[PDB]
Amino acid sequence: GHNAKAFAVAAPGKMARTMQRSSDVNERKLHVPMVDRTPEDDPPPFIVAVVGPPGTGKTTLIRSLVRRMTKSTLNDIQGPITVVSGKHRRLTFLECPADDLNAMIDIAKIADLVLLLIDGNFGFEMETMEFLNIAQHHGMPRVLGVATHLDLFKSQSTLRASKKRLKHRFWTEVYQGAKLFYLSGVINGRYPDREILNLSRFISVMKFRPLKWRNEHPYMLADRFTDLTHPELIETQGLQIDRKVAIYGYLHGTPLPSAPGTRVHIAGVGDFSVAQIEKLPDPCPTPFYQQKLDDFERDKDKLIYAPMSDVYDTWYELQKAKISKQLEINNIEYQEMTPEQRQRIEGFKAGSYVRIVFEKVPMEFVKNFNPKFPIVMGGLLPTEIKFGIVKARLRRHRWHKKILKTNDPLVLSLGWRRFQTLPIYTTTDSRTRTRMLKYTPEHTYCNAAFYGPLCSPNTPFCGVQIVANSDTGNGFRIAATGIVEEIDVNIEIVKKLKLVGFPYKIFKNTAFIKDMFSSAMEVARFEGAQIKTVSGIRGEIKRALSKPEGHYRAAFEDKILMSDIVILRSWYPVRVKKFYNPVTSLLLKEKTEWKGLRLTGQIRAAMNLE
Amino acid sequence: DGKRAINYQILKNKGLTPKRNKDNRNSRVKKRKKYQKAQKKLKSVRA
Amino acid sequence: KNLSSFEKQQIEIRKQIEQLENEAVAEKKWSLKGEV
RNA sequence: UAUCUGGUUGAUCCUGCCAGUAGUCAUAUGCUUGUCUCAAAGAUUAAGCCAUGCAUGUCUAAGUAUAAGCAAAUACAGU
RNA sequence: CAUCCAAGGAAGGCAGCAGGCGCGCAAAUUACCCAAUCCUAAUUCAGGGAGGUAGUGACAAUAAAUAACGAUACAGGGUCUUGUAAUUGGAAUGAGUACAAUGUAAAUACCUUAACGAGGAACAAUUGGAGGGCAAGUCUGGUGCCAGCAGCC
Numbered sequence: 051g052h053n054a055k056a057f058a059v060a061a062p063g064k065m066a067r068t069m070q071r072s073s074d075v076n077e078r079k080l081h082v083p084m085v086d087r088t089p090e091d092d093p094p095p096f097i098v099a100v101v102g103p104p105g106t107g108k109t110t111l112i113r114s115l116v117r118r119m120t121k122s123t124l125n126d127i128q129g130p131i132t133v134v135s136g137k138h139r140r141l142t143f144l145e146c147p148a149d150d151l152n153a154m155i156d157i158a159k160i161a162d163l164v165l166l167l168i169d170g171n172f173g174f175e176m177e178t179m180e181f182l183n184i185a186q187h188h189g190m191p192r193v194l195g196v197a198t199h200l201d202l203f204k205s206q207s208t209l210r211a212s213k214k215r216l217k218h219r220f221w222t223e224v225y226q227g228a229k230l231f232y233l234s235g236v237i238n239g240r241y242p243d244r245e246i247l248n249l250s251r252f253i254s255v256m257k258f259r260p261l262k263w264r265n266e267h268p269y270m271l272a273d274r275f276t277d278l279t280h281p282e283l284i285e286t287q288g289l290q291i292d293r294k295v296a297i298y299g300y301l302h303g304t305p306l307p308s309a310p311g312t313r314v315h316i317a318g319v320g321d322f323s324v325a326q327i328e329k330l331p332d333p334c335p336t337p338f339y340q341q342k343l344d345d346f347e348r349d350k351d352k353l354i355y356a357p358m359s360d361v362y363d364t365w366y367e368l369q370k371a372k373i374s375k376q377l378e379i380n381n382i383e384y385q386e387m388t389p390e391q392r393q394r395i396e397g398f399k400a401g402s403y404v405r406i407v408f409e410k411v412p413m414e415f416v417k418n419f420n421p422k423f424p425i426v427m428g429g430l431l432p433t434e435i436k437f438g439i440v441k442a443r444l445r446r447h448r449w450h451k452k453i454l455k456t457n458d459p460l461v462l463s464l465g466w467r468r469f470q471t472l473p474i475y476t477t478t479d480s481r482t483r484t485r486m487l488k489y490t491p492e493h494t495y496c497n498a499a500f501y502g503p504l505c506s507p508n509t510p511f512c513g514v515q516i517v518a519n520s521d522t523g524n525g526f527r528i529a530a531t532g533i534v535e536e537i538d539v540n541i542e543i544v545k546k547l548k549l550v551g552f553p554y555k556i557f558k559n560t561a562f563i564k565d566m567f568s569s570a571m572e573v574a575r576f577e578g579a580q581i582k583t584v585s586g587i588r589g590e591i592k593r594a595l596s597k598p599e600g601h602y603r604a605a606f607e608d609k610i611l612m613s614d615i616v617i618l619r620s621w622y623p624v625r626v627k628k629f630y631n632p633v634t635s636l637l638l639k640e641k642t643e644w645k646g647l648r649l650t651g652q653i654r655a656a657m658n659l660e
Numbered sequence: 661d662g663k664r665a666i667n668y669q670i671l672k673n674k675g676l677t678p679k680r681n682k683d684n685r686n687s688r689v690k691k692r693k694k695y696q697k698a699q700k701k702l703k704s705v706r707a
Numbered sequence: 708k709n710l711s712s713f714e715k716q717q718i719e720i721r722k723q724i725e726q727l728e729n730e731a732v733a734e735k736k737w738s739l740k741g742e743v
Numbered sequence: 744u745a746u747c748u749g750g751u752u753g754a755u756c757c758u759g760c761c762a763g764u765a766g767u768c769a770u771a772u773g774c775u776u777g778u779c780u781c782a783a784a785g786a787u788u789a790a791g792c793c794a795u796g797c798a799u800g801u802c803u804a805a806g807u808a809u810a811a812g813c814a815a816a817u818a819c820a821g822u
Numbered sequence: 823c824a825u826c827c828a829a830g831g832a833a834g835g836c837a838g839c840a841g842g843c844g845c846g847c848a849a850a851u852u853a854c855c856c857a858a859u860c861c862u863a864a865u866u867c868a869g870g871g872a873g874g875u876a877g878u879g880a881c882a883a884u885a886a887a888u889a890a891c892g893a894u895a896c897a898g899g900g901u902c903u904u905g906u907a908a909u910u911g912g913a914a915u916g917a918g919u920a921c922a923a924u925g926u927a928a929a930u931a932c933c934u935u936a937a938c939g940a941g942g943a944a945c946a947a948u949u950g951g952a953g954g955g956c957a958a959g960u961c962u963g964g965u966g967c968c969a970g971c972a973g974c975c
């Protein structure tokens with residue numbers, strides 16, 4: 051065609067360095083492709099969960115945010131509260147119960163934006179670290195730090211140094227360069243206007259990431275609660291029969307199909323099947339939805355809905371294009387067909403205000419109900435309704451002080467479920483068999499088998515100890531991190547066991563041995579095995595004597611000494627326990643302390659024996 | 661108070677670093693005893 | 708007076724917990740030990 | 744004053760390449776980051792697109808004062 | 823390209839200072855002031871995101887803390903010279919905290935200083951590597967395999 055000499059440039063080195071740096075910038079954009087599965091017409095409100103220590107002032111933060119984005123001060127905040135921002139955005143705020151870890155774990159599983167608040171004068175606390183680890187293990191949402199109580203500092207030098215230290219600790223825990231907000235005072239029950247304005251501005255322009263777990267399993271945030279039973283049914287049969295309960299909220303993630311009887315998991319409650327579902331009209335619509343509606347026929351102050359409270363070129367590019375083109379073919383075949391069968395075959399895509407109703411609901415979900423704890427509903431894949439044993443890998447968490455122990459209770463969260471199991475920790479005998487480990491290694495990973503509901507492979511899980519708020523102390527609560535390797539029913543776990551025995555009559559190259567067995571058939575069953583002495587000479591067993599009850603005769607290569615003690619080495623197969631206990635943390639009269647099985651050291655200290 | 665305070669292990673965040681001597685903080689003392697062992701060796705061989 | 712479904716579920720969970728704790732606090736089985 | 748050593752050979756020599764050690768107004772990244780002084784910061788890929796706020800106004804004794812403006816020389820007289 | 827609405831019409835240009843988007847993988851404050859340097863006007867007086875001040879990822883660069891002197895017992899060179907020690911004795915001091923004063927447009931900070939502040943100096947230094955090259959291991963244990971010897975060491 052032409053010459054490469056003619057199409058040259060004036061500067062080689064600048065091309066070399068700019069091209070290398072541009073290649074690095076271009077490979078910074080590459081990612082692993084997944085699917086969004088988010089609606090384009092009416093996206094659901096983003097969930098903003100505020101998380102921090104008890105007395106640090108999160109209610110004032112959500113109060114100031116709502117006041118700045120609505121010009122309306124609201125008091126007595128409880129439950130999720132929905133606000134509209136801009137022309138398309140809606141944010142549902144939710145306050146975290148600080149003391150409980152259960153709803154805390156559910157919040158970290160559910161939330162899309164997490165406002166994490168830290169006392170500036172005190173410093174970082176254990177609740178912040180625990181929530182950060184739970185969020186990191188279960189799929190990290192967008193974390194935004196805010197620091198309060200900064201008017202308690204009496205010097206500017208200490209204030210600047212503490213701000214730098216908190217910012218760098220946050221940059222260690224979260225990505226580096228993450229910006230966090232500094233809140234000055236509470237002078238009128240709320241924060242200064244400029245900082246609240248910057249908080250509102252940052253979250254009104256931010257975009258979110260498609261997490262792996264949110265894009266296949268449908269989930270639901272419940273905004274209000276109502277019990278639907280006839281009062282005569284309450285009166286006549288003793289007020290205790292399990293009830294029909296209808297609950298309201300917003301669907302996120304995946305269309306939950308419109309056929310009745312789909313299986314449902316409620317975190318902190320259990321597992322049900324939904325009786326009926328329907329799509330109520332949205333009670334807090336975006337304004338743009340209102341001009342769209344008015345355009346179908348061609349909300350000045352109700353921006354708050356709080357019923358809970360009182361008033362090609364690159365492979366990455368072509369795979370993303372493939373995901374987008376199958377998404378738009380699915381959308382365009384959805385658009386050309388009647389809306390009733392759209393509702394029938396897709397089943398309530400996200401952004402829909404959905405009222406669902408179950409049957410057979412216990413009392414303590416209704417009787418001891420409180421508005422200050424979140425309610426989370428979750429759709430279930432079929433693989434998660436089956437039970438079995440799971441073989442995973444886990445480590446002792448690097449901030450947990452003490453190691454774990456085999457056959458001890460562990461309260462672990464996996465998927466949408468949170469339950470207490472009795473795992474057995476095994477190592478491998480160098481890819482030959484499954485060696486049973488009595489303890490947990492201090493700095494390496496061990497496999498673990500435990501009974502529970504099945505799940506997809508490569509699904510993260512996180513275990514903790516007892517969740518009662520009384521005997522917490524200064525210790526850290528996360529105890530096991532890892533992913534699941536495989537699901538099965540039975541695996542071979544092997545424990546080495548050496549039976550002990552003594553000699554009583556010594557011939558030459560032949561001994562008479564007693565004190566391991568008590569019957570002749572026990573010796574006759576184990577004939578042909580090899581017994582080894584303590585000193586180290588080799589031999590085997592030969593015959594069982596008839597008239598003695600347990601004495602038998604065995605062979606040896608050398609003359610056995612009288613004080614030598616024989617042992618027989620066997621490989622006893624042990625089995626897992628089939629205990630499955632859901633935590634039912636939302637089904638308690640206090641919900642701050644739930645005790646199931648206690649640790650071995652705990653019960654040994656309780657009844658005073660070693 | 662009931663506020664669960666921070667721990668030293670989880671604040672400074674130095675995990676699995678090898679335990680080094682007190683004299684590795686200051687280079688002057690380490691080079692002092694290095695030169696001192698060197699002159700002891702020199703005094704032992706130049707007798 | 709009368710028992711609910713939650714009450715019977717919690718009492719059977721509680722007796723399972725009591726049985727498991729009694730099994731755990733007791734001495735281990737000879738097949739679950741070493742150099743026995 | 745000017746940092747090279749091997750392989751490519753059983754040795755002797757070109758030629759390119761590879762492995763290693765060291766220096767970097769070189770790009771990117773990681774770990775760590777107590778004090779003093781100092782001073783660089785959206786060019787590298789897009790002179791791509793911009794919410795909101797500010798960035799150019801100005802009166803002397805000395806151009807025009809009936810402000811139903813403010814306080815105290817019947818032509819005005821201060822501000 | 824793109825904003826507003828009553829649908830008739832009106833309005834737009836951050837390669838100024840902040841700040842945001844441009845990937846779902848990221849990086850300074852939408853801060854204070856004309857006190858300094860100068861610029862503008864009718865003009866000593868007003869204005870100036872020009873500019874200065876402070877804040878912010880170790881750009882780059884300078885100087886520099888994290889210890890110093892002993893007594894006792896062993897190991898020494900062997901009567902005068904050193905090391906080791908869950909041994910011991912008093913001195914000296916700033917990283918921080920802080921009345922004050924200085925500093926500054928007002929501050930922060932620096933320089934100065936009444937007082938507090940050190941034995942595990944816990945007031946808790948890091949990053950790598952070890953036959954070579956151009957330095958520092960003829961150190962230790964464990965793991966996968968062997969139709970090699972013995973046979974479960």
Ligand SMILES: Nc1nc2c(ncn2[C@@H]2O[C@H](COP(=O)(O)OP(=O)(O)OP(=O)(O)O)[C@@H](O)[C@H]2O)c(=O)[nH]1
Binds near residue numbers: 105235
């Ligand atoms: N000094 C100071 N006080 C604050 C600040 N923020 C909040 N407070 C005070 O801290 C108090 C406690 O916070 P709460 O209003 O009770 O909010 P909360 O974190 O949900 O605490 P609980 O309601 O008990 O769970 C408030 O009454 C505020 O007066 C702050 O930034 N500085």
Ligand SMILES: [Mg+2]
Binds near residue numbers: 107108109110
């Ligand atoms: Mg509150």
